[PDB]
Amino acid sequence: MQYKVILNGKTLKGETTTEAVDAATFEKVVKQFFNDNGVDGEWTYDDATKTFTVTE
Amino acid sequence: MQYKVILNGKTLKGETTTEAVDAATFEKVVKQFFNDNGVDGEWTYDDATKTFTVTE
Amino acid sequence: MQYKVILNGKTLKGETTTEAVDAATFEKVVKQFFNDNGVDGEWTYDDATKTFTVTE
Amino acid sequence: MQYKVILNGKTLKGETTTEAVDAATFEKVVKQFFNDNGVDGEWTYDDATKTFTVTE
Numbered sequence: 001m002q003y004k005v006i007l008n009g010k011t012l013k014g015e016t017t018t019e020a021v022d023a024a025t026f027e028k029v030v031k032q033f034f035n036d037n038g039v040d041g042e043w044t045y046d047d048a049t050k051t052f053t054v055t056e
Numbered sequence: 057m058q059y060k061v062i063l064n065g066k067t068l069k070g071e072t073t074t075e076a077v078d079a080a081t082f083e084k085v086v087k088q089f090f091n092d093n094g095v096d097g098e099w100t101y102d103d104a105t106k107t108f109t110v111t112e
Numbered sequence: 113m114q115y116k117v118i119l120n121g122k123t124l125k126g127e128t129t130t131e132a133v134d135a136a137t138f139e140k141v142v143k144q145f146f147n148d149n150g151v152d153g154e155w156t157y158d159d160a161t162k163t164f165t166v167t168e
Numbered sequence: 169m170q171y172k173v174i175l176n177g178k179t180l181k182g183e184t185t186t187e188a189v190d191a192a193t194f195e196k197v198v199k200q201f202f203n204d205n206g207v208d209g210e211w212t213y214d215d216a217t218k219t220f221t222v223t224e
Contacts, residue, residue: 001064001079002161004102005086008057020093023057023218030061030220033085037076041223045216046060050191051116052198055209060219079162086164097167101160106135107172108142111153113191116214117171117198132205135169142173145197149188158172 007026009019019025027043063082065075075081083099119138121131131137139155175189187193195211 001062001082002159003061003063003082003086004161004163005059005061006057006164007059020090021095026057026059029089030059034077037074038224039077039220039222041221043218044221046219047114049114049116049214050211051214052118052207053209053212054207056206058215058217060217062220094168095164095166097165099162100165102163103170105158105170105172106155107158108151108174109153109156110151112150113174113176115173115175115191115194115198117173118169119171120169133202133207135171138171141201142171146188149186151189 005026007021007023009022031039031043061082063077063079065078067075087095087099117138119133119135121128121134143151143155173194175191175194177187177190179187199207199211
C-alpha cells in the first residue's frame with residue numbers, strides 16, 4: 001500500500017518555537033522506526049511529473 | 057513536501073516473524089506520532105487514477 | 113516522463129449539451145494517437161493510495 | 169479522473185525515422201486536442217515527492 005503524507009513545517013505568522021513535520025524529521029523517524037523491522041536504503045526523489053493547469 | 061511510503065505486510069513464504077509495515081501500523085504510528093504536534097482528521101483514499109500498460 | 117491529465121466531463125448546471133474530456137475519449141484518442149507509433153496494451157488502474165486529510 | 173501517461177523520447181536502439189511519445193508532442197497534441205473544447209493555460213510541474221528505496 002502506498003501512503004501519502006505531506007510534511008513541510010507549514011509556515012505561518014507567529015514565530016512559533018519548534019517544528020514537527022520536517023522533511024528531515026520524516027526521514028529520521030520513518031527510517032529509525034522502520035529500521036527496527038529490517039528496512040534500509042536511502043531516500044530517492046520520485047520521477048518528475050507534469051500537470052496541466054487550467055486558465056482560459 | 058509529499059512523502060511516498062509503501063507499507064504492505066507481504067509474507068508469501070518464510071519464517072513466522074512479524075511485519076511492522078502494516079497499513080494499520082502506519083495510520084496508528086503516523087497519527088499518534090504527528091498528533092503530538094497538533095495534527096488530526098482521518099485517512100482518506102486518494103483520487104482514482106488510470107495508467108496505460110504497454111503490451112504489443 | 114510522466115504526464116498528469118484530469119479528464120472528467122463533470123456538469124453542475126443543467127445544459128450539458130456535450131462533452132470532450134471523457135474517460136473513454138482519452139483511452140480512444142490516446143490509444144489511437146499513440147498506436148500510430150507502435151504502442152498497445154490496455155488501460156490498467158493505478159495502485160491504491162491513501163492520503164491523510166487534516167481536520168482538528 | 170486523473171490519467172497517467174508516460175511519454176519519453178528514449179529510443180536508444182534503432183535508427184532515425186520518427187517519434188510520437190515526445191514531451192513536446194503531448195503538450196501540443198493534448199493542448200491542441202483539448203483546446204477545441206475550451207481548455208487553456210500552461211503545463212505546470214507537479215509537486216516534488218520523495219520515495220524510499222529499499223536496499224539492506
